[PDB]
């Protein structure tokens, strides 16, 4: 019966098509700002001097890019990780020259995905459902913070964050491998295990649930219509799938419990992506992957190459060719 | 070749590829000794130059330069403490150590004055610092 | 019978206090004898290079591969 | 007759010992840069 109470009821209303809530109060403006500035900068933005050497790089469609090559270029290396809003620039043109839109988009987007985590928690509380879907979302967000925020902080420049494009993403990958050897770093290997196992278990679980669907459908009708939304009964025989998978490998391997099965499904990719996000966070501060170069030497003591050395050759080619005009000294300490 | 056993050591330090054992102090006594000719010369040079550095600090204080005056006490003087320690230990005298501590405290007070941009206290304290340094110089001797 | 029922059985361990270490040591003498280097052709730490063979050995023909392998691995 | 907790303890101890011997060999002898 007070204006603030009515406002809080509307914000926390489960009747809006899209739930807002208090985390949505912070998410919607930030995400909308990030979307608007990203669209405007991707379709039309002047070239950006990413490396701080007065060599602008084009990332916008109007300046001769396609959807694959387009990007919002990272900030200038001259800026570093100084805060660079529009009002800290002498003009908007020189704000765009040094890649300020990247800072704007990244900050607003990171705040928005944090709000998305909190909003996922919130709706669940209103629903009365258990929390933790939010905890699963953190793993994707953690990786995004690792690449967009933590890697600039460790390396000391927003030029080092991943570009907001497709080809720039590949560039960031290749430079990261050249400088840190992420492939040999075990956290990235755990992430590869996480995504590959997520695909494996997704295919397996979908295959076994679809394979043991209870007959509730005629032959001239899609099997999916055998399930009615909100029904009380199970739509497939858990016993049949469990027995098939037990015969496939061995009985003990199969998850006879469905809740444990789904916990494992939620656990494997979330933990894998947590580990790889943490690996990128640690290589931000230059704790690199393994370096087995010249680890095998003969009795005389001359190096017998291994696959690590041949990988090192590719890393070295990428290292020498990346940012050809930016380095004046032999070591890539920055 | 065709039946040659691989070498095998069971946690032994003898093999070339064994990681056990110290790297230093294994093959003889060190050549280096404390206060050698070249190092004593270097410390003597630093201590002698510290007088000029202090004089330049006083001049910068007189002109009011605060950044330059502060940096004068850490430019060519960053080795002053180590040099003074090494030469005072050569002297082995209580009064030398007391003047050493007095110079250190006076220099710290001078810095605390320079951050405050206090011209009068800065002048007084650079004068006191120079006097204490010259007293320690006459004490330990050779500078 | 169930796995744990076998593992905790004493007979299991009377068998595998002797069987398992036997082959665990058989592998030890398989490699310590240098027999692996001869069966599988793997150079020892003192066989990657030799006189006139300070470069990497490579087989450059499909059909004479055995011939040049002996020629290179004459030792 | 042997409690399976003791069997698990000793077996895990031995497996960890074997893996640690592998780790030592990784820091010693052939395969180590030294």
């Amino acid at each position: 019966a007070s204006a603030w109470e009515r406002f809080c009821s509307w914000i926390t209303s489960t009747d809006n098509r899209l739930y807002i809530g208090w985390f949505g109060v912070l998410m919607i403006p930030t995400l909308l700002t990030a979307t608007t500035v990203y669209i405007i900068a991707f379709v039309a933005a002047p070239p950006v001097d990413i490396d701080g050497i007065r060599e602008p790089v084009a990332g916008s469609l109007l300046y001769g890019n396609n959807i694959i090559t387009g990007a919002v270029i990272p900030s200038s290396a001259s800026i570093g990780i100084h805060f660079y809003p529009i009002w800290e620039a002498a003009s908007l043109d020189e704000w765009l020259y040094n890649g300020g839109p990247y800072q704007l988009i990244v900050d607003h987007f990171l705040l928005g995905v944090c709000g998305w985590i909190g909003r996922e928690w919130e709706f669940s509380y209103r629903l009365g459902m258990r929390p933790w879907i939010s905890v699963a979302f953190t793993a994707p967000v953690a990786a995004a913070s690792a690449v967009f925020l933590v890697y600039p902080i460790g390396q000391g420049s927003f030029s080092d964050g991943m570009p907001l494009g497709i080809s720039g993403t590949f560039n960031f990958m290749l430079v990261f491998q050249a400088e840190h050897n992420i492939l040999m770093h075990p956290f990235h290997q755990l992430g590869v295990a996480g995504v590959f196992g997520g695909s494996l278990f997704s295919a397996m679980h979908g295959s076994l649930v679809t394979s043991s669907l209870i007959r509730e459908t005629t032959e001239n009708e899609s099997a999916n219509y055998g399930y009615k939304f909100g029904q009380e009964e199970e739509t497939y025989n858990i016993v049949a799938a469990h027995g098939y998978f037990g015969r496939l490998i061995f009985q003990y391997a199969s998850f006879n419990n469905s809740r444990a099965l789904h916990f494992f499904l939620g656990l494997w990719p979330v933990v894998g992506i947590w580990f790889t996000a943490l690996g990128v966070m640690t290589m931000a501060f230059n704790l690199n992957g393994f370096n087995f170069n010249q680890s095998v030497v003969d009795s005389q003591g001359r190096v017998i190459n291994t696959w690590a050395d041949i990988l090192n050759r590719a890393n070295l080619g990428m290292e020498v060719m990346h940012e050809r005009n930016a380095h004046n000294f032999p070591l890539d300490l920055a | 070749a065709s039946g040659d056993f691989p070498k095998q050591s069971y946690f032994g330090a003898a093999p070339i590829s064994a990681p056990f054992g110290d790297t230093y102090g294994t093959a003889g006594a060190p050549i280096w000794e404390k206060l050698g000719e070249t190092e004593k010369g270097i410390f003597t040079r630093i201590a002698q130059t510290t007088k000029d550095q202090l004089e330049q600090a006083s001049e910068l204080i007189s002109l009011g330069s605060w950044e330059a005056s502060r940096q004068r006490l850490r430019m060519t003087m960053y080795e002053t403490r180590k040099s003074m320690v090494r030469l005072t230990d050569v002297d082995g005298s209580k009064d030398a150590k007391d003047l050493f501590a007095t110079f250190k405290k006076k220099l710290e007070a001078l810095d605390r004055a320079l951050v405050a941009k206090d011209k009068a206290l800065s002048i007084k304290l650079i004068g006191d610092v120079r006097a204490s340094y010259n007293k320690w110089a006459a004490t330990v001797g050779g500078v | 019978r169930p796995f744990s029922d076998i593992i905790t059985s004493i007979r299991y361990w009377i068998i595998h206090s002797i069987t398992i270490p036997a082959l665990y040591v058989a592998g030890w003498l398989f490699v310590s004898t240098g027999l692996a280097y001869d069966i599988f052709g793997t150079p020892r730490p003192n066989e990657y290079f030799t006189q006139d063979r300070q470069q990497v050995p490579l087989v450059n023909d499909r059909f004479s591969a055995k011939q040049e392998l002996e020629d290179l691995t004459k030792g | 007759r042997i409690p399976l907790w003791l069997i698990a303890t000793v077996g895990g101890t031995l497996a960890l010992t074997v893996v640690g011997i592998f780790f030592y060999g990784s820091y010693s002898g052939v395969g180590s840069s030294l």
Partner: peptide, 29 residues
């Protein structure tokens, strides 16, 4: 003997190779 065959076909090479590997840790160049 099929149980014996499967489990021991897995096991015997495994212990043999593990013994060889633990020995191979000591080759010492």
């Amino acid at each position: 003997t099929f149980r014996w065959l499967a489990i021991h076909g897995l096991a015997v090479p495994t212990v043999f190779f593990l013994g060889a590997i633990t020995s191979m840790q000591f080759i010492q160049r």
